[PDB]
From a paper:
Herein we present the development of a PluriZyme, TR2E2, with efficient native transaminase (k cat: 69.49±1.77 min−1) and artificial esterase (k cat: 3908–0.41 min−1) activities integrated into a single scaffold, and evaluate its utility in a cascade reaction. The reaction proceeds through the conversion of the β‐keto ester into the β‐keto acid at the hydrolytic site and subsequently into the β‐amino acid (e.e. >99 %) at the transaminase site. In addition, we report the crystal structures of the TR2 enzyme and the newly designed TR2E2 PluriZyme. It presents the typical type I fold of class III ω‐TA observed in known structures present in the PDB database, and it contains the characteristic pyridoxal‐5′‐phosphate (PLP)‐binding domain composed of β‐sheets and the catalytic base Lys289.
Additionally, we succeeded in growing crystals and solving the structure of TR2E2 bound to the PLP cofactor (resolution of 3.5 Å) and in complex with the ethanolamine O‐sulfate (EOS) inhibitor (resolution of 3.6 Å), located in the transaminase catalytic center. The artificial esterase catalytic triad was observed in the TR2E2 crystal structures and is composed of Ser172 and His173 of chain A (magenta) and Glu317 of chain B (green); similar to the transaminase's active site, the esterase site is composed of a functional protein dimer. Notably, the distance between both active sites is ≈20 Å, with the esterase site being more solvent‐exposed and located at the beginning of the tunnel and the transaminase site being more buried in the protein structure. When the residues Ser172 and His173 were replaced with Ala, the activity was completely abolished. Thus, the A172S and Q173H mutations in TR2E2 (located at site G in Figure 2) do not exert a deleterious effect on the original transaminase activity and, importantly, confer esterase activity.
Numbering used by the authors:
A (entry chain A): 34 to 455
B (entry chain D), D (entry chain C): 34 to 453
C (entry chain B): 38 to 455
The structure:
Amino acid sequence: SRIITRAEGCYLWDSDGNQILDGMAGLWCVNIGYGRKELAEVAYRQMQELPYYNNFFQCSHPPAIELSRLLSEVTPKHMNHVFFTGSGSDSNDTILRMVRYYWKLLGKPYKKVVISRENAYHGSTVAGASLSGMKAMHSHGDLPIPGIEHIEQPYHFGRAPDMDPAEFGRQAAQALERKIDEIGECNVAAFIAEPIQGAGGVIIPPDSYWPEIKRICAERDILLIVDEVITGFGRLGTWFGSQYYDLQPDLMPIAKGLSSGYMPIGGVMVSDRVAKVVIEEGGEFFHGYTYSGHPVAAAVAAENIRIMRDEGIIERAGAEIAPYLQARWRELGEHPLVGEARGVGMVAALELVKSKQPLERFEEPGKVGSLCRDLSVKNGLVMRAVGGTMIISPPLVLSREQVDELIDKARRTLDETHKAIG
Amino acid sequence: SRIITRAEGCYLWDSDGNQILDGMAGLWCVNIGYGRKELAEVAYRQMQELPYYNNFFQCSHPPAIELSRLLSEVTPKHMNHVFFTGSGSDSNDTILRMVRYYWKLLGKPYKKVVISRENAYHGSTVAGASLSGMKAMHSHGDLPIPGIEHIEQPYHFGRAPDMDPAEFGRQAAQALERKIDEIGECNVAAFIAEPIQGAGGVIIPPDSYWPEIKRICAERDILLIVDEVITGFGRLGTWFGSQYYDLQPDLMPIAKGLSSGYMPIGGVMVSDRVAKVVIEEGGEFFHGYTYSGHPVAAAVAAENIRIMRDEGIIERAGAEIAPYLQARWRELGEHPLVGEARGVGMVAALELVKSKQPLERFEEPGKVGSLCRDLSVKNGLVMRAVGGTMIISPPLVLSREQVDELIDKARRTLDETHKA
Amino acid sequence: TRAEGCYLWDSDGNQILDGMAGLWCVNIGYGRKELAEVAYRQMQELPYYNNFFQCSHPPAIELSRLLSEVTPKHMNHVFFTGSGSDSNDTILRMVRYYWKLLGKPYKKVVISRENAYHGSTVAGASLSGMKAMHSHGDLPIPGIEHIEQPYHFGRAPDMDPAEFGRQAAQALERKIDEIGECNVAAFIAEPIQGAGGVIIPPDSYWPEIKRICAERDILLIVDEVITGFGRLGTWFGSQYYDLQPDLMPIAKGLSSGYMPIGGVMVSDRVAKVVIEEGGEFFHGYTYSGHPVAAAVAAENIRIMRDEGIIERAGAEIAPYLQARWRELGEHPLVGEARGVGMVAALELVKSKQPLERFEEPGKVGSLCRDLSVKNGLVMRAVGGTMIISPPLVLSREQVDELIDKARRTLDETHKAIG
Amino acid sequence: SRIITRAEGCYLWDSDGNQILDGMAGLWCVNIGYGRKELAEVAYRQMQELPYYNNFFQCSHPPAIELSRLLSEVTPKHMNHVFFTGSGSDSNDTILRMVRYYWKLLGKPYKKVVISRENAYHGSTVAGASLSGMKAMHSHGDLPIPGIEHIEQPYHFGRAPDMDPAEFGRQAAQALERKIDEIGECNVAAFIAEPIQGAGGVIIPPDSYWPEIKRICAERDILLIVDEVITGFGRLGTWFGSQYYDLQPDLMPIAKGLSSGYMPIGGVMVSDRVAKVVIEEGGEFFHGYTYSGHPVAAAVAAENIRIMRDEGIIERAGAEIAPYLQARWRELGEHPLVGEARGVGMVAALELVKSKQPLERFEEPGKVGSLCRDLSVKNGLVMRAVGGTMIISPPLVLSREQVDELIDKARRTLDETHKA
């Protein structure tokens, strides 16, 4: 209902001339901010060079290879292969398809089960929507397809506000060992988790969770799938949310920040463990499946990544602005309407609550965040509402002046929300 | 293989200065031909104003809504509603999702099965690869997801060369009625077929098939899902392969030629029937989470469609160069190595056969076509080989002057292979 | 119908290349979507502007800055009006008021040229040398005299061009010493006469005329309606001939034909007098143009300099076009192949070896105009002159198209006449 | 000075959030009121199709022909013929040009004089400014181009406050017969007047006046030209101020409210009389007599006219809100600082005076009106001050609820001035 005339930097100007700070990077994706001519230029060039090449006819300096090199260099040091695709949901299909195929080639075809988390988002294909724990998506059809289970999420504030933050961290990761010993270790092929859940609020694991979950992936013989669709490309202060939590994923769906949202593209990083098996000594994969991603989108994604490592914008993001934003978000932790002030790197969330000292949640808390979102825009700041959780995922080029806009506009938006409610 | 440097029109010049008539529009997709600056311009202009935006906010003359009017005009027989996605494989996911969700809303949740065909291509996601009858993609152990069946394909030349084509046509279309009587009408949600199986050898149904399969879909209460990804946008002489065969799809995935291959986008056309139920009186938008279509990709695709109706290139393809190409492809049917000369509109195929009067196929017939494909690239003509099938999907910009070029490289390419 | 690029598709499904930019105006070509949006946006905000209440970021201010930036040189003031004909009225009106304020109300005469077009209002038609327009009543109004045009082909085909240029530019001093310098307020000329058949001055004319306008005390009015916005390779035909006008009508390419607008660049000399130290705007005062049209026109200039479409026009395709036009000078029907920048003409003649002209050459050219459209090329006819003013986005592949369609059109006409 | 931001209906909101009812129409022109998105829609759609009518050509269904059809049904009776131009000032040039040409074609080139009126506005070109009577414009030089004379205006209040209205009406229109009898009937080609002088104060002729002018224009062989630029399109209660005063103009300039001020355009309506002669038995006004206007401005203008006849806003304006507005305006005539309250249709004026029963006019009365204007905006009402005359030209969308707003802010605005 807003209608946007101009979009440049971290801003959205609206039809009536109102400047709106985009705290959401649109949809977690535009990391270098808007209005980058350098991406529109490389698109124009590649749409004229060759817009769709097959395997019998490659062009000269094809973008699939320019991109492949940059990503093997920017990604963790064990992941040095990539396969492309048309969005970030496609990525979770290929992972499902190939994680199972890895075990078949290792002689254990019974290993085909894939464990997820409740309130986890992994795509919207028929496989992304089954792996995703959003129980609302599962209504449409008998969606959770065979071989997909789901386990507890580490939402300390919403499940168990009183448990020791770190004892809960250990408990909710052992929820994985529980589901392993009920299904059968030899039936489980892998575990997939966002380093942080975007779509469910900014649900951040206690610092204990990921360590225990890595332990379990060793005692039991299973692959790790980290979904860097959102936490990828500077979103957690680091190139990939894996290196924030010292994970060694055996697969990673990527998208969004790959092209800063300027072009549909997704891919999957493939660790060297699983590459020796499915690529060498394996060609039934890539049968019909063809992973020479759309050349125009890989061309943009290449320039997108050059822009971020050469102008050091994600290195500056994690070193200079991420602290200030996180330190100052906590400041909103004292507003009477706010229960938790959550956040890591360049992403953050607020919990909206009826009273704090007894900490009672609202009956219908979505109606409360749904209002606060409508008043953040009406005060010049985009901020999503999952439930009564307010979230921001700003572009990575944000400047400290633009966080003090964000904080002061948030405080105003909370004060207005707090007056209406009582 | 060859390193294409430049590409304009229907030609690809490679590192060595060789002109190569692209008979495969790249991968059945570049319909307005290569080298159309007007599309690269509109992409440049849209990536500058708004490269992407949340659905809460919108653009002023949003690119996706303009596209939607065009698709509701070029062919809206009764299809005046479209949902978009990131590729054409994503598209068949949204159909399976929503075909099941439509019957749920009419009180029949047990109607959830979708019948496909053997050797049909319907995507490469985990649902496209299940719907598709390619037995190689199924190699997985349990790829065909629950609730997907497959039936006989109407490949007259390869299934049953002697049967009368129209009785073989009715035979393969009743394979649909047979599968319904085993599965149970109340379990079947819909049946889906390409109008012509592209990815599987240009396998053209006898003229008897589609008439029957529409009959079965009416007597039985099952939705018809026509896959215009590969046949859509002039490829079949008409705007869409449906109006050529008088179909009334209740869903049509489209892609590849929506944007003439310049930009990842696909969608599903939605007939006014199924639209009444799922859109009004229902909240699933779109597959199950909102996707209004990437503005940059919708911007290209829209201008691409204008270029095609406003310069009338799908009209000229279907009126002047298709008849000519179809007339002349047949001319190759007499060559000693050609059993069938198949073709409709701007798509066509040849079968390679060891002997014709005894009608022998090769043992290992794939080895022969891969050699003939290798000899068209070597003679300046791209030509795909599915099996012992040679196929062409030239762009819609071909000129009558250029079909005579394509025929000659074909006749030239065949003489050599018969000589090996 | 579906006009896109340099092409106009017809009601009958036919592709026609517009070598006329419609009417000397669509410079960024047709089918430019970004201009329709800024119109949509501006019509939504407000439809009027006056001093007692105006909108925010009114386009008149944006356009005024753009027209006083890498567009003119010593002209840093502009006034807007509803067309390019209104523009020559404002100039006529204010040239006289400039002298009134210097104590010289006797200075009110304005010398023009024969076959110069300067508008179609009652004063544009007086300033214009077209004698068909003068019939309507006693049109040539008081003031306004006319002198010889520098049309070397039709006036004096054999004289040395360089001096024929000096002679026709002294026609200005001759008319001054006949009327009286202290009665003359100014001289007005297109840098090139478009509507009169792309009449290109010998390189000598414009040099002399600058001489005369110093020795004699008179203002210079250069009519950049057609030659403005790249038509001559340069932003304005002034900087092609190193002229320094004290007034310039601008229109047409101001908005590439997308929205009615015109203006006047006003040199700093004459602004010190009429603007500072003067009124003039006493309910005339419609110095504010229509906001929607200024908004369209502003985007038009950004697009033209930001994509450098007139810098490329003069540097890359104009030479190709001009050079390739000359090739038609060999055709049996062609005496001269004239042309500068992005504009050019052909003269149709009965024969070349004695240079014989036609009995009724318009009836011959009116025929060729009718056959260029029929072979897919718009080409206007002044008399027996064929003229083209293609949009500035033309591509060399489309000039090779323009030349081939012309040669065919000339060959066909050469068969008919014979 | 007063920055406006959003504008809707009969309202303007400024930078401080103040609602200001526009009692003018900006410049007498916005008739369908502000904020009509449907006008921006048709302009965006036309600028894409054909932004510049080439030559003797057409797009598909050119906008100039539809405008002419609408304008020949809206201005029917004699008329049925129209030209186009870029402003309304350009229009009076085309009239002067062709009125002289009409007589030239009748063998009478000496009939070339055009009689106008003092303090009348007819344009800002050198001919509009010659015809226009206000000497502020003529002082620039010898503006009155040869062949233009001017006569007395029918301003009962300012010329002759005591003469009986009807007798002063006959007295002033015979100023036309006097001037014919001095110049020579055979030199006078036509006489032209606004039905009501807008730009010069809302000077409304006595009811006796226009009857005499029609008398004079018959006995003597001279054409009548009525300037419906300001009074046209509902401004005078009826579609055109002509039919209110039952005039039969042989030419009418139109412009404001042709497009509600959203797009530069004007035209001249041409009676059948002058049409037979300048079209047939002549027509050497080139192919372009003028015509076409501008495809875009014609499209905007066509839509503006549909909105006014399909929603009947000009029929309702004179039938429902106008009677009311004129009746309540009289009320302000009783205020001690107000002498005369004039008004017709959707236009009305007030005279500012020192005392009423001695009838003293102010010395420097514009300074009183300039002050009252600045105080009407200061109290949320636009109201022009031509001299010491206050005038209002509210849009035609005004509501009876909205007239009570205008009277109250007026009475309030008048009280402030009365002690100052």
